[PDB]
């Protein structure tokens, strides 16, 4: 394809109190890119703890009922790009 | 066993909403980590600001923003060779 896939905006680090919801969002250059999220470099295990949202080129990860266990670096991956930010559960 | 095969476990509902209001469909599937596929009249929806696609565990949801009469259609969630359809009527 004419234009190369990349992740456009960067992602800010977030701090949330325990039990509150945390969200990460990023945007990509192309439609029809699948979401792929890592926690500390490893694919997140899908469960009712995580909501994955896509709207247009916006990809969101929603982390429910946070605990100190959720404090980590989260990464979105597509093509040859990736973007990371930290969650601190307070 | 039945769990060796991916399948729809809970259907979505027919729905009516007034113009410009938000509409949503929710179904459930048998397994975690299933991709979402949504159709509008048999054809894959085009990703845009119009549609929010949500997966939470086994729950799959399509949210249709700012409805218009052009949104009135049969929507389908596709789970491999398994499908579920329901109608949005924008009134
Ligand atoms: Ca970038
Ligand atoms: Ca079925």
Author numbering:
A (entry chain L): 2 to 91
B (entry chain A): 1 to 91
Paper text:
Evidence accumulated over the past two decades has identified titin as a main coordinator of cardiac muscle homeostasis, and its dysfunction through genetic mutation as an important factor in cardiomyopathy. For this, we examined the unique mSNP T2850I in the I-band domain of titin I10, as a paradigm of an alteration in a general component of the titin chain. Domain I10 does not support specific interactions or have any known specialized roles, so it does not constitute an a priori sensitive locus of the chain. In previous studies, we have shown that the T2580I mSNP destabilizes the affected immunoglobulin (Ig) domain in titin, I10, and speculated that this instability increases the vulnerability of titin to proteolysis in situ potentially leading to myocardial damage.
We calculated a total of 17 molecular copies of I10 originating from two different space groups and diverse non-crystallographic symmetries. The structural features of all 17 molecular copies of I10 were in strict agreement (global RMSD = 0.62 Å for 82 matched Cα atoms across all models, calculated using MUSTANG). T2850 is stabilized in this conformation by two hydrogen bonds: (i) a short, strong bond (2.4 Å) between its side chain hydroxyl and the carbonyl of the previous residue, E2849, and (ii) a second contact between its main chain amide group and the main chain carbonyl of T2897 in the neighbouring EF loop. The side chain hydrogen bond turns the otherwise atomic clash into a productive interaction and permits T2850 to adopt a high-energy conformation within the generously allowed αL Ramachandran region. When mapped onto the crystal structure of I10, the perturbations largely clustered around the mutation site, in the A'B β-turn and the neighbouring EF loop that are interconnected through hydrogen bonds mediated by T2850.
